[PDB]
């Protein structure tokens with residue numbers, strides 16, 4: 160169909176009132192004698208006395224102004240008839256639209272906005288978005304907002320672009336730098352219409368942009384002198400504090416120092432840890448040092464951040480080691496041994512080791528000067544008295560021919576302590592240790608342990624066991640040989656199974672009585688006792704749990 164033309168009324172009608180809106184007229188008005196009147200939301204219902212028509216001319220007036228931000232449109236109906244009563248007259252639905260006018264300024268949803276952006280951000284990266292509202296007619300100049308920057312802190316250089324239409328904030332081609340300016344605080348303005356700058360006061364808010372930190376600054380040592388100082392024989396003491404400076408955000412892992420030993424500490428003498436409060440590398444000892452051995456313990460360390468460096472600065476960074484000298488102070492220690500342990504090798508044979516020979520010494524030296532010190536040497540824990548120690552020259556000599564088979568000998572080594580006391584006050588007592596390693600010679604033959612034993616009549620076998628006290632290879636496995644004496648007995652008594660140091664023996668005939676069984680037990684070297692190894696074996700009759708039948 161066709162839309163109706165609505166009269167255009169200007170909101171906030173200054174005047175003069177009563178305001179002439181328009182004039183409705185009927186053509187069937189010359190025949191009859193038509194009056195005029197009006198009815199709808201705006202005259203007879205919500206609200207009344209806005210408009211009214213003269214009952215004859217058809218002229219519609221207005222008597223009160225109105226706000227378009229309350230009454231967008233208005234649908235009324237036009238009926239106008241004579242004073243008789245007129246029934247079939249189609250009333251046109253007149254409509255009346257109130258035009259809009261910029262009667263309200265744009266306003267921010269907040270009096271203060273807050274945003275944040277990383278340092279070294281690529282250009283045209285979105286920071287945040289401010290926003291405001293205009294209660295006027297949308298899609299008209301009276302509602303088109305135009306955002307502008309009034310002022311900026313610290314004003315220069317300009318690192319921010321404000322899209323005046325969207326309110327979105329962006330970073331410019333000039334790169335941001337937190338170390339230059341860490342935070343930006345801004346005052347903004349919003350305009351309507353053509354976004355034109357006049358001298359008219361418009362509302363304004365504020366924006367506070369915080370710049371976030373990135374690790375884009377290498378650490379630097381500030382210490383003028385880097386020399387350490389430590390005493391001899393000390394532990395757990397502070398060597399040096401390396402004061403390091405970093406530009407990045409204090410407290411962050413981008414600012415916290417980090418240390419690693421480049422060289423000079425795979426001996427493990429130093430431990431380093433970072434003081435998170437002053438940013439000092441605290442290096443400390445974890446091992447005593449002997450000045451008489453090491454007069455300087457210089458070393459190097461490389462510096463960095465707990466967090467990795469930003470890509471922007473990588474490979475421009477050459478890890479350059481930093482040297483730091485350390486000196487050791489001397490201290491009096493008195494007499495000592497060059498070695499707490501001496502190894503002395505002796506033999507069980509009279510052909511080399513002789514009872515009463517000198518076999519070594521234990522000279523005590525004043526640790527500080529290194530010269531032979533006057534001391535009083537003394538034996539200690541010589542369980543079988545193998546040694547004589549001269550109290551004056553510390554010379555050591557045999558008191559017995561050393562017996563490798565001695566129960567006091569262990570691992571083939573006979574351990575003996577020694578002590579030295581210093582002259583002058585105070586008496587310092589230090590202990591030495593001598594490992595006497597004895598050469599084992601084949602001086603023991605395999606002998607039985609139970610040469611006289613008595614078995615039962617129901618016994619299955621016999622267990623003869625030998626014993627060569629020598630250590631390998633002068634004992635090793637034995638070779639058992641039952642010999643034919645008396646004759647035939649080699650057959651009467653047989654070997655069943657043999658081990659290294661024993662053999663299981665069974666008699667074939669199984670007669671009840673004593674038998675003297677001669678063996679020849681031989682070493683692993685072939686040696687065998689001069690004595691006849693004879694087994695005197697008596698077979699009695701065993702009653703159950705009764706041993707032998709002791710008579711009737």
Ligand SMILES: *[C@@H]1O[C@H](CO)[C@@H](O[C@@H]2O[C@H](CO)[C@@H](O[C@@H]3O[C@H](CO[C@H]4O[C@H](CO)[C@@H](O)[C@H](O[C@@H]5O[C@H](CO)[C@@H](O[C@@H]6O[C@H](CO)[C@H](O)[C@H](O)[C@H]6O)[C@H](O)[C@H]5NC(C)=O)[C@@H]4O)[C@@H](O)[C@H](O[C@H]4O[C@H](CO)[C@@H](O)[C@H](O)[C@@H]4O[C@@H]4O[C@H](CO)[C@@H](O)[C@H](O)[C@H]4NC(C)=O)[C@@H]3O)[C@H](O)[C@H]2NC(C)=O)[C@H](O)[C@H]1NC(C)=O
Nearest residue numbers: 184185186187188189190191192193240241245247248249
């Ligand atoms: C205000 O009041 C007015 C009072 O009349 C009124 O005006 C009237 O409106 C009518 C339309 O609805 C008009 O009718 C048209 O008339 C023309 C020609 O008419 C003239 O010529 C005729 C012969 O020459 C004559 O007979 C006509 O009528 C007579 O007129 C006298 C006075 O002039 C009347 O006497 C008065 O009576 C009083 C008491 O009642 C009193 O005594 C007075 O003293 C006395 O003078 C008399 O009563 C009257 N008689 C009649 C019968 O009207 C007049 O002189 C025609 O050509 C038109 O024809 C169309 O309409 C017909 C309707 O059926 C169809 O049959 C036709 O075919 C044709 O239809 C279509 O037309 C279109 C073109 O328009 C074509 O394209 C189509 O093809 C066609 N369709 C087909 C099918 O063919 C029509 O009849 C009337 O003339 C007019 N009168 C006056 C005086 O103005 C107003 O309308 C009122 N105001 C409002 C706003 O409503």
Ligand SMILES: *[C@@H]1O[C@H](CO[C@@H]2O[C@@H](C)[C@@H](O)[C@@H](O)[C@@H]2O)[C@@H](O[C@@H]2O[C@H](CO)[C@@H](O[C@@H]3O[C@H](CO[C@H]4O[C@H](CO)[C@@H](O)[C@H](O)[C@@H]4O)[C@@H](O)[C@H](O[C@H]4O[C@H](CO)[C@@H](O)[C@H](O)[C@@H]4O)[C@@H]3O)[C@H](O)[C@H]2NC(C)=O)[C@H](O)[C@H]1NC(C)=O
Nearest residue numbers: 608620621622623624625656657658659660661662663664
């Ligand atoms: C002929 O008899 C030989 C000895 O006679 C026996 O001696 C004891 C063990 C009793 O059985 C007794 O009834 C007999 O008269 C026999 O030689 C022995 O044989 C056994 C098994 O073949 C060997 O046992 C092994 O012992 C070693 C350690 O032994 C030495 O160390 C222990 C301390 O741990 C000393 O107490 C002993 O005196 C030995 O000097 C073990 O490592 C191993 O495992 C378990 O055995 C021992 C008990 O013997 C446990 O205490 C451990 O904790 C382990 O759980 C073996 O059991 C034995 O060494 C060997 N020699 C001696 C001197 O006992 C011989 O085998 C017989 N003839 C034949 C043909 O078998």
Ligand SMILES: *[C@@H]1O[C@H](CO)[C@@H](O[C@@H]2O[C@H](CO)[C@@H](O)[C@H](O)[C@H]2NC(C)=O)[C@H](O)[C@H]1NC(C)=O
Nearest residue numbers: 416417418419420431462463464465466467468
């Ligand atoms: C800060 O120093 C520590 C201490 O050494 C570094 O940790 C070492 O890293 C290397 C390389 O992967 C490993 O081989 C070591 O085993 C690590 N040692 C320890 C104790 O963790 C750490 O990498 C350094 N931090 C930075 C960012 O360089």
Ligand SMILES: *[C@@H]1O[C@H](CO)[C@@H](O)[C@H](O)[C@H]1NC(C)=O
Nearest residue numbers: 268287288289290291292326
């Ligand atoms: C802009 O203002 C409207 C109206 O309050 C709101 O719905 C919208 O979220 C705002 N935009 C932003 C980015 O806050």
Ligand SMILES: *[C@@H]1O[C@H](CO)[C@@H](O)[C@H](O)[C@H]1NC(C)=O
Nearest residue numbers: 568569570571572573594596
């Ligand atoms: C002494 O014997 C023990 C026990 O088997 C062994 O651990 C040690 O290495 C031996 N000492 C030597 C071979 O000097």
Ligand SMILES: *[C@H]1O[C@H](CO)[C@@H](O)[C@H](O)[C@@H]1O
Nearest residue numbers: 580581585586587588589
């Ligand atoms: C160390 O050895 C003994 C242990 O008492 C002392 O008597 C000696 O004088 C030295 O101090």
Ligand SMILES: *[C@H]1O[C@H](CO)[C@@H](O)[C@H](O)[C@@H]1O
Nearest residue numbers: 576578587588589590591
């Ligand atoms: C060395 O060693 C003994 C014990 O082995 C100590 O008790 C003594 O004081 C000496 O200095």
Ligand SMILES: *[C@H]1O[C@H](CO)[C@@H](O)[C@H](O)[C@@H]1O
Nearest residue numbers: 499500576590591592593
């Ligand atoms: C040799 O061995 C003893 C251990 O029994 C040590 O304590 C001593 O100091 C010496 O060097």
Ligand SMILES: [Ca+2]
Nearest residue numbers: 226227228262
């Ligand atoms: Ca208004």
Ligand SMILES: [Ca+2]
Nearest residue numbers: 259260262295
């Ligand atoms: Ca408005």
Ligand SMILES: [Ca+2]
Nearest residue numbers: 261263301351
């Ligand atoms: Ca506006």
Ligand SMILES: [Ca+2]
Nearest residue numbers: 336337338375
């Ligand atoms: Ca920077």
Ligand SMILES: [Ca+2]
Nearest residue numbers: 372373375407
């Ligand atoms: Ca930074």
Ligand SMILES: [Ca+2]
Nearest residue numbers: 376405413464
């Ligand atoms: Ca850093």
Ligand SMILES: [Ca+2]
Nearest residue numbers: 449450451526
């Ligand atoms: Ca020393």
Ligand SMILES: [Ca+2]
Nearest residue numbers: 490491492527
């Ligand atoms: Ca010293």
